[PDB]
Amino acid sequence: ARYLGPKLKLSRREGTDLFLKSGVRAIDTKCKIEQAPGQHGARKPRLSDYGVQLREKQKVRRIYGVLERQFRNYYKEAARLKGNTGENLLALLEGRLDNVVYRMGFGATRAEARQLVSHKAIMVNGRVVNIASYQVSPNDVVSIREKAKKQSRVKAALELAEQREKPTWLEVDAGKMEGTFKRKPERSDLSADINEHLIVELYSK
Amino acid sequence: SARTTPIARYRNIGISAHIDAGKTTTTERILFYTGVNHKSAATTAFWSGMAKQYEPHRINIIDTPGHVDFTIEVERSMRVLDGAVMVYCAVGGVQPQSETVWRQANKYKVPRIAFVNKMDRMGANFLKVVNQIKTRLGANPVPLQLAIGAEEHFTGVVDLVKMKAINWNDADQGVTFEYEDIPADMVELANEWHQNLIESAAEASEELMEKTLGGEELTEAEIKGALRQRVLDNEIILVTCGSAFKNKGVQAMLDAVIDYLPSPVDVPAINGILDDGKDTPAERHASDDEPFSALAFKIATDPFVGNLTFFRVYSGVVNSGDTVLNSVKAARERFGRIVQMHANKREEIKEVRAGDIAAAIGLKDVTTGDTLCDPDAPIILERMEFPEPVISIAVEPKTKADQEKMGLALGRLAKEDPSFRVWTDEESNQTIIAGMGELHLDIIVDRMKREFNVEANVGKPQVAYRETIRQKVTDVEGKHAKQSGGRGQYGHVVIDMYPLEPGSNPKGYEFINDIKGGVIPGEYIPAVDKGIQEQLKAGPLAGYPVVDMGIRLHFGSYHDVDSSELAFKLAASIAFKEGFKKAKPVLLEPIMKVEVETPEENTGDVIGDLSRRRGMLKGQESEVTGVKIHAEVPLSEMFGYATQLRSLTKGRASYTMEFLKYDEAPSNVAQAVIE
Amino acid sequence: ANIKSAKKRAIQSEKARKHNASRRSMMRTFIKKVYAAIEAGDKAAAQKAFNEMQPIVDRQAAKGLIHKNKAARHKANLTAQINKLA
RNA sequence: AAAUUGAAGAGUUUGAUCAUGGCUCAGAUUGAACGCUGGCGGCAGGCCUAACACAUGCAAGUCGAACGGUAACAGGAAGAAGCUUGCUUCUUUGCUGACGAGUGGCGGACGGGUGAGUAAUGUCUGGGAAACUGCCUGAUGGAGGGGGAUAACUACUGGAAACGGUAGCUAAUACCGCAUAACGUCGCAAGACCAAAGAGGGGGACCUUCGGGCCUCUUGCCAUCGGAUGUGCCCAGAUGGGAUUAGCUAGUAGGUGGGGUAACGGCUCACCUAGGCGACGAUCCCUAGCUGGUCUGAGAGGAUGACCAGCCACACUGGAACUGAGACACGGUCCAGACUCCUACGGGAGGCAGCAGUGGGGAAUAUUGCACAAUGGGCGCAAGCCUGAUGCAGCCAUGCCGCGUGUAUGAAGAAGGCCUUCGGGUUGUAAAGUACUUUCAGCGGGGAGGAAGGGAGUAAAGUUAAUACCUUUGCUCAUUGACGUUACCCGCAGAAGAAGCACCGGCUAACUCCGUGCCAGCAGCCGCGGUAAUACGGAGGGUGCAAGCGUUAAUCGGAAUUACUGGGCGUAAAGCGCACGCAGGCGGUUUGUUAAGUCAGAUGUGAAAUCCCCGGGCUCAACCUGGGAACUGCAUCUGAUACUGG
Numbered sequence A: 001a002r003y004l005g006p007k008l009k010l011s012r013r014e015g016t017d018l019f020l021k022s023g024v025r026a027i028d029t030k031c032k033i034e035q036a037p038g039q040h041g042a043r044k045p046r047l048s049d050y051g052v053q054l055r056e057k058q059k060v061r062r063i064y065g066v067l068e069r070q071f072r073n074y075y076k077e078a079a080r081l082k083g084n085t086g087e088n089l090l091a092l093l094e095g096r097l098d099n100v101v102y103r104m105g106f107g108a109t110r111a112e113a114r115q116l117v118s119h120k121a122i123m124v125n126g127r128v129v130n131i132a133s134y135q136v137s138p139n140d141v142v143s144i145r146e147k148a149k150k151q152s153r154v155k156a157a158l159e160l161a162e163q164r165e166k167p168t169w170l171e172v173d174a175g176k177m178e179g180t181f182k183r184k185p186e187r188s189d190l191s192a193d194i195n196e197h198l199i200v201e202l203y204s205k
Numbered sequence B: 001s002a003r004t005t006p007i008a009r010y011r012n013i014g015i016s017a018h019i020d021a022g023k024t025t026t027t028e029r030i031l032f033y034t035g036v037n038h039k040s041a042a043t044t045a046f047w048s049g050m051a052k053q054y055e056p057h058r059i060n061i062i063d064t065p066g067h068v069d070f071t072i073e074v075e076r077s078m079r080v081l082d083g084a085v086m087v088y089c090a091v092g093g094v095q096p097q098s099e100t101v102w103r104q105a106n107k108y109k110v111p112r113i114a115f116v117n118k119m120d121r122m123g124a125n126f127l128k129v130v131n132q133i134k135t136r137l138g139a140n141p142v143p144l145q146l147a148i149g150a151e152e153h154f155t156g157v158v159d160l161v162k163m164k165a166i167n168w169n170d171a172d173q174g175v176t177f178e179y180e181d182i183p184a185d186m187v188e189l190a191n192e193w194h195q196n197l198i199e200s201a202a203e204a205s206e207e208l209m210e211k212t213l214g215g216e217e218l219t220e221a222e223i224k225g226a227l228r229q230r231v232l233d234n235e236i237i238l239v240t241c242g243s244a245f246k247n248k249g250v251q252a253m254l255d256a257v258i259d260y261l262p263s264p265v266d267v268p269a270i271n272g273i274l275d276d277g278k279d280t281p282a283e284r285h286a287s288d289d290e291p292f293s294a295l296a297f298k299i300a301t302d303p304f305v306g307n308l309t310f311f312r313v314y315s316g317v318v319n320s321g322d323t324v325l326n327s328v329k330a331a332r333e334r335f336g337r338i339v340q341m342h343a344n345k346r347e348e349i350k351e352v353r354a355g356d357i358a359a360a361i362g363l364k365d366v367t368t369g370d371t372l373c374d375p376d377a378p379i380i381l382e383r384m385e386f387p388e389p390v391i392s393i394a395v396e397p398k399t400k401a402d403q404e405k406m407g408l409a410l411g412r413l414a415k416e417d418p419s420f421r422v423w424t425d426e427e428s429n430q431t432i433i434a435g436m437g438e439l440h441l442d443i444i445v446d447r448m449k450r451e452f453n454v455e456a457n458v459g460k461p462q463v464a465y466r467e468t469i470r471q472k473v474t475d476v477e478g479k480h481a482k483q484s485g486g487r488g489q490y491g492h493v494v495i496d497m498y499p500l501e502p503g504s505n506p507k508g509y510e511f512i513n514d515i516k517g518g519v520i521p522g523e524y525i526p527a528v529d530k531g532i533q534e535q536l537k538a539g540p541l542a543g544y545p546v547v548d549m550g551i552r553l554h555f556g557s558y559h560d561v562d563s564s565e566l567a568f569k570l571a572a573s574i575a576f577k578e579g580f581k582k583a584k585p586v587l588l589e590p591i592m593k594v595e596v597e598t599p600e601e602n603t604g605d606v607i608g609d610l611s612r613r614r615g616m617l618k619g620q621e622s623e624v625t626g627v628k629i630h631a632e633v634p635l636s637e638m639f640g641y642a643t644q645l646r647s648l649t650k651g652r653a654s655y656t657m658e659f660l661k662y663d664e665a666p667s668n669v670a671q672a673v674i675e
Numbered sequence C: 001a002n003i004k005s006a007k008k009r010a011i012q013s014e015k016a017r018k019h020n021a022s023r024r025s026m027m028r029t030f031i032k033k034v035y036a037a038i039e040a041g042d043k044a045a046a047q048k049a050f051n052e053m054q055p056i057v058d059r060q061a062a063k064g065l066i067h068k069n070k071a072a073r074h075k076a077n078l079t080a081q082i083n084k085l086a
Numbered sequence D: 001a002a003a004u005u006g007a008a009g010a011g012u013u014u015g016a017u018c019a020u021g022g023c024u025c026a027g028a029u030u031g032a033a034c035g036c037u038g039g040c041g042g043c044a045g046g047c048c049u050a051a052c053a054c055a056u057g058c059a060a061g062u063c064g065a066a067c068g069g070u071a072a073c074a075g076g077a078a079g080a081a082g083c084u085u086g087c088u089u090c091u092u093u094g095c096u097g098a099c100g101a102g103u104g105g106c107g108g109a110c111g112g113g114u115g116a117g118u119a120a121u122g123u124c125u126g127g128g129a130a131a132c133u134g135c136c137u138g139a140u141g142g143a144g145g146g147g148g149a150u151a152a153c154u155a156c157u158g159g160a161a162a163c164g165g166u167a168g169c170u171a172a173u174a175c176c177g178c179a180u181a182a183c184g185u186c187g188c189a190a191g192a193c194c195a196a197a198g199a200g201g202g203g204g205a206c207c208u209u210c211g212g213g214c215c216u217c218u219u220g221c222c223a224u225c226g227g228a229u230g231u232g233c234c235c236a237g238a239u240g241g242g243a244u245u246a247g248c249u250a251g252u253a254g255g256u257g258g259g260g261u262a263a264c265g266g267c268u269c270a271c272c273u274a275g276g277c278g279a280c281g282a283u284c285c286c287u288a289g290c291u292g293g294u295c296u297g298a299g300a301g302g303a304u305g306a307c308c309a310g311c312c313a314c315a316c317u318g319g320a321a322c323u324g325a326g327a328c329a330c331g332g333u334c335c336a337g338a339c340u341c342c343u344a345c346g347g348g349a350g351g352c353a354g355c356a357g358u359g360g361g362g363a364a365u366a367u368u369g370c371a372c373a374a375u376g377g378g379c380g381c382a383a384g385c386c387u388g389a390u391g392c393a394g395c396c397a398u399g400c401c402g403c404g405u406g407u408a409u410g411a412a413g414a415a416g417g418c419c420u421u422c423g424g425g426u427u428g429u430a431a432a433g434u435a436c437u438u439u440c441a442g443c444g445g446g447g448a449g450g451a452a453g454g455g456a457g458u459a460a461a462g463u464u465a466a467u468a469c470c471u472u473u474g475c476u477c478a479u480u481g482a483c484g485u486u487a488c489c490c491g492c493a494g495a496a497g498a499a500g501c502a503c504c505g506g507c508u509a510a511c512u513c514c515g516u517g518c519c520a521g522c523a524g525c526c527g528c529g530g531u532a533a534u535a536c537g538g539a540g541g542g543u544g545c546a547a548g549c550g551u552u553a554a555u556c557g558g559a560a561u562u563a564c565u566g567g568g569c570g571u572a573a574a575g576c577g578c579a580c581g582c583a584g585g586c587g588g589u590u591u592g593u594u595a596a597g598u599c600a601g602a603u604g605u606g607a608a609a610u611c612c613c614c615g616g617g618c619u620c621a622a623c624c625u626g627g628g629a630a631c632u633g634c635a636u637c638u639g640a641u642a643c644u645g646g
């Protein structure tokens, strides 16, 4: 129910940095981005309309580490909610604990976030949770366990948090390794390289 | 929970004897004895003994089928049961079947004790049988007891070791076990026998020999212990006597089993491969702590209790609801309503302690010869050899409708008995079946019409033939032409035909492209070959697959526009026709080498029968235990040979068949098949 | 009967059946007396027969043999036929 | 404030095109099955076939506070004491607790199962009149006084068993008279007639028939009028297909009169009349339990009725009645029939479509489990007993849901594999190595919630005559958990126990090499294979999904391809050869009236669950749950009169 194979094959297939690696090194030096994985990764064949829609969907799923069944439930939830389906779907994907832990920087990537959340090392409002896809309500407080406070990996990710651009809606206190969820993003803070419109008509065939 | 089982006290015994030797009769009495004492179907029973001094031992009794066709059934019980009580008829003495059954047990090193029976029948002498046993089985049998009286005069038996001419009451079979003085006329014989028993017991223990040398009158208990030691070591064949019909001697052999015949703990532990990949000999000891291990056998059925599966617990203690991996099938199944049988009635049991035999209701994957090991797949157990079938007859469903039922029925039969095996004939699609014995096939068909309600007539298996040319026929001409309106196809061919020696070509056919030059464009060479091949399979003389035929194409003609692969293919077939006719072929029968082992005294009988079946012998082997003969008896002629062979060898012979070579059929036989 | 209480109820039902049949015929025969008097046409005989049976139907209706509606309707249309006679 | 904010196309007829038209595909779904593979937990589901046959165990008992009574256990005591440092009171008694069997009361008509029958005598929707109703509830009054019998029991006797028979004795809230007779029944009145039962707790004075009466509390009984609940009956509409089924009907349709039913009624009989149904489909034939709902669809609609809830019908087959408030009765009776079993051969016994299970059938569906602790039911004053309902556990990836199978670092990119224009590329930061982490599994310990109540004591109040008994309210104490070694929490050790399936010619995401050579084979459609096959088989690479993945079956969709929404008929399929004409469908124009259609308002219904919206609780989720919306369908009442109809 997870991905265990090579990480940068995913970043290669959609041809862009997917943040799967910690970013301590340059992704270009670590791997050749402009080539697709496999023996034919030299060739770039003409991709059809269905192909580009599928690549967009698979790109979002591999950024957030979510499988297809989970992701289809998010889309149905997004379509049921009032508003607009595209940014509603993105909003749920943000409220997952993996993303919020990762974005606040206690984990270098979602995989550290996954270990941290799933190894009972994350508390929300002081309650221990180990479910990766637990939605985060606004005004909820996520903090590190006192046992987990003395581990090297968590403090290591705090520096990389600064190394990248800080999220405006998450307020962090690395002095005691805590963070606050003020409210959800509005799709204006998120990266524009994700075309959420293609997602709607992929699942609405 | 607690085992609550008197370990070592319980014994496992098997009754084996020649056909009509009284085995079933005495077993019935045995059950009566143990039942009143408290107050190959598995029958457990707590036997305390005739004098009941011994704490009630849980004796398990599993009679065996005397008939030769059911050797496997006897074999199954023999391995499963550590001790075996042989039965020998007083008047008949040792008989072929008894000799036969003894050797398999020797192979398994299973300790044995024998009980002479039918003493009441006029014309019987226990001492004569003892002599017969030692000569036939080559094993010294110390007489545990000496029969007093014969036929009508026969009144009882005097224990040799204990020196008491026990005389059971006429009123009831076993109420009184009173011990009396040896009859005056018998004491003299009893005396010599007692000394003989004392020396024999002494050598077995060796220490006892030292006291015997000094002349000390060895205490009866000490010598008795030495006797059991040798029994575990499996040398002395202890023998007791009595008449089951007269209700005398059955109880005596039961007590002997308790105090001499070894217990499951006594018998050496089983072995096997811990893992399938490597031999890994582990020799799991008979311990409840050791992971549970058992072997399934004699799967059966009950219309209201379901399938019945018999398992021998060697080590461990399985409990209800415990998944159990079948090593041979590599899959695990859960034990449900484990049930044991107390003969008179069936009693449910949640779990079975080690050393006891019960039944597992509803165990679908449990079948004959299944290693029911623990889920962790511990050491698998050795697998019991299975003898091949000797007689094979073709059974045909009475109606096409029956076919469906017929196939399913035979399949289930194979499960209960591995030896019984069925298969469909590749040609003529005949349901040829084979069984361990003629009587076995008879019983199979009988129960098929009853339990499965399927009537099927039995007829001899039909034989397939080759049919091949004899003399080389060269320069055969075959021309094909289809010159007609639209599109004509022409393709002429000229080939030669020469018989191939069987050894020369394994395939039996050849197609050298001798064609000097491009006499054929080359695109039609495969086509020509294909045409012959179809004809090769379809025998012109009598529809049989021609073998040992050598043809090489050398000349051919074609029409510039009408040249067609199909034309040459058909033309090739044409050439085959004329060539085959002029070569006057001869049908070939499956002459097969046959090796027959038989007793020396019956060598002549065997030779005559082999010769009679148009089989020319090629060798004689003078093996110590009988002569080994070899012959290429025609398969078509050899049908029912197993049954015929037994009568000429007093049911003491066997044969292994292996196809040798297809040879020319004699004029009469060949013509019969042609017509 | 496989249930112990089922056997008991069988026995009591037979006993109550016999008792009820006797009582029901005993009542029913009195209605027959008055009906026969009606077709005989003697009003005095009919009234005598009627006031013999009148407590009987009411007693049976009260004790549980029949319904008080059944007792009422029997006695109701009997008086109707008596009054039509005279 | 929120309560559907909802519709996609592609391949294939041709040398090419347009159209028509079928076939196929992309989606969702399932009580699924099979193949390959498989770690965990949560919740749910699990014989669709043979309404086929059934071994065995259990599934409906309870009441001593109705009665006789003592078979059984314990208590109690007359007495030689069965006995001796009296350990013990072994012959006796209902005297006590309590209770086998028996009479009696209630329950057994509930709960549980199955879908054979049933096209409407059932179901759904909305009404209605001629009814009954145990237990529960409100009120008004009675509850007086007698009789005979019968089990059980005792004796005798028959039988293998099932089980009886003969005679004698004994009760009762068992049964039966007499008294009583009103707001009850009949009648119009006058009048006539109809019932009942005692038992238990406690006690002051008195009287003793030294048994008790007696006094009060509770509970039970009888009558009548109500309430509620349940059921019986009636009507209209709706609820499948076939005209290659056109006539059907003789208690048939109606009336009078008698009988019958709790009640109306040809319900039944006698007589009288000749009617009744039917083209708006009677009759006959096939199929079928109906609904809320479920699946799909943008909607209309199409399919469907497994789980959950309502109703109906059945209980081996056919029929019948009895008891009862209620049955024509799953674990009751009687008869007949098919089948099976026991036997001493004289006769008897049985009914898993209850739970579990076996055989059989089948592609296919589970344990011969635990506990009444919770909720519910039956009995009982309660305590308690019973409960295969139910609560749980076991088995199965059968669904949905969640998690894990690690985490960073890591190079000229090791080895090997593969391609190679021999230069290199690719697997691939992937691995190894470095550091880190311990979720779930395992081992050890700790430990919620489902628990409300019931029991003993005491205080207070009622209450009487009262301090008594009994009830109501607190207070003190000792206890009540199948699941359960519970969820959950903590400690431990180590990456250690955990990834497979399908596909890669186009439709459709993803390409090369080797084998093979129209062969082997593949294939949903077009089709591929006869020496460079991206289509077969293998291998590297990739893609999709993931503890699952595929295939098959089945439903809807796409299919506007039965077109009501929403299609066509000159030539693609399709205008009767033509006309007349009954039923039917439709109808010019003006005024009046009616208010049937139509429209508006209101009222009552449209069960709950489900679907949808806003919330709440399992750590999330599935799941559970509060409210709302919805169910705009039916019926009634009031109103409007433009259009349709009269």
Ligand SMILES: C=C1NC(=O)[C@@H](CC)NC(=O)CNC(=O)[C@H](Cc2c[nH]c3cccc(OC)c23)NC(=O)[C@H](Cc2c[nH]c3ccccc23)NC(=O)c2csc(n2)[C@@H](C)NC(=O)CN(C)C1=O
Pocket (backbone or CB within 6 Å): B388, B389, B390, B391, B392, B421, B423, B425, B426, B432, B434, B435, B461, B462, B463, B464, B590, B635, B655, B656, B657, B658, B659
């Ligand atoms: C070579 C051939 N392949 C086989 O026979 C395949 C078919 C499964 N079985 C075997 O090789 C193995 N044995 C089997 O499995 C069975 C059982 C068996 C196992 N070992 C045995 C030893 C002794 C007797 C046995 O049996 C009691 C057996 N026993 C048969 O089958 C028999 C005998 C036989 C024919 N051959 C054999 C080669 C070796 C051993 C036995 C044979 N059969 C006919 O009596 C018969 C008469 S006519 C006819 N069959 C038709 C079918 N045509 C032919 O025989 C022509 N032909 C040459 C072959 O068929």
Ligand SMILES: Nc1nc2c(ncn2[C@@H]2O[C@H](COP(=O)(O)OP(=O)(O)O)[C@@H](O)[C@H]2O)c(=O)[nH]1
Pocket (backbone or CB within 6 Å): B017, B018, B019, B020, B021, B022, B023, B024, B025, B026, B066, B117, B118, B119, B120, B121, B242, B243, B244, B245, B246
């Ligand atoms: N006279 C006599 N006959 C015996 C005795 N034991 C067995 N038999 C007979 O032997 C016959 C077969 O006995 P059985 O047990 O069935 O032997 P099985 O056929 O091998 O199983 C029976 O008819 C018995 O009457 C015996 O001790 N004396």
Ligand SMILES: [Mg+2]
Pocket (backbone or CB within 6 Å): A001
């Ligand atoms: Mg999942």
Ligand SMILES: [Mg+2]
Pocket (backbone or CB within 6 Å): B023, B024, B063, B064, B065
């Ligand atoms: Mg036998």
Ligand SMILES: [Mg+2]
Pocket (backbone or CB within 6 Å): B020, B092
């Ligand atoms: Mg003989």
Ligand SMILES: [Mg+2]
Pocket (backbone or CB within 6 Å): none
């Ligand atoms: Mg069924």
Ligand SMILES: [Mg+2]
Pocket (backbone or CB within 6 Å): D115, D289
């Ligand atoms: Mg039905």
Ligand SMILES: [Mg+2]
Pocket (backbone or CB within 6 Å): D173
């Ligand atoms: Mg009474």
Ligand SMILES: [Mg+2]
Pocket (backbone or CB within 6 Å): none
């Ligand atoms: Mg009176």
Ligand SMILES: [Mg+2]
Pocket (backbone or CB within 6 Å): none
């Ligand atoms: Mg009275």
Ligand SMILES: [Mg+2]
Pocket (backbone or CB within 6 Å): none
């Ligand atoms: Mg009438």
Ligand SMILES: [Mg+2]
Pocket (backbone or CB within 6 Å): D288
């Ligand atoms: Mg049906």
Ligand SMILES: [Mg+2]
Pocket (backbone or CB within 6 Å): D297
């Ligand atoms: Mg549509």
Ligand SMILES: [Mg+2]
Pocket (backbone or CB within 6 Å): D324
């Ligand atoms: Mg009645």
Ligand SMILES: [Mg+2]
Pocket (backbone or CB within 6 Å): D329
């Ligand atoms: Mg019943």
Ligand SMILES: [Mg+2]
Pocket (backbone or CB within 6 Å): D330, D331, D352
């Ligand atoms: Mg039943």
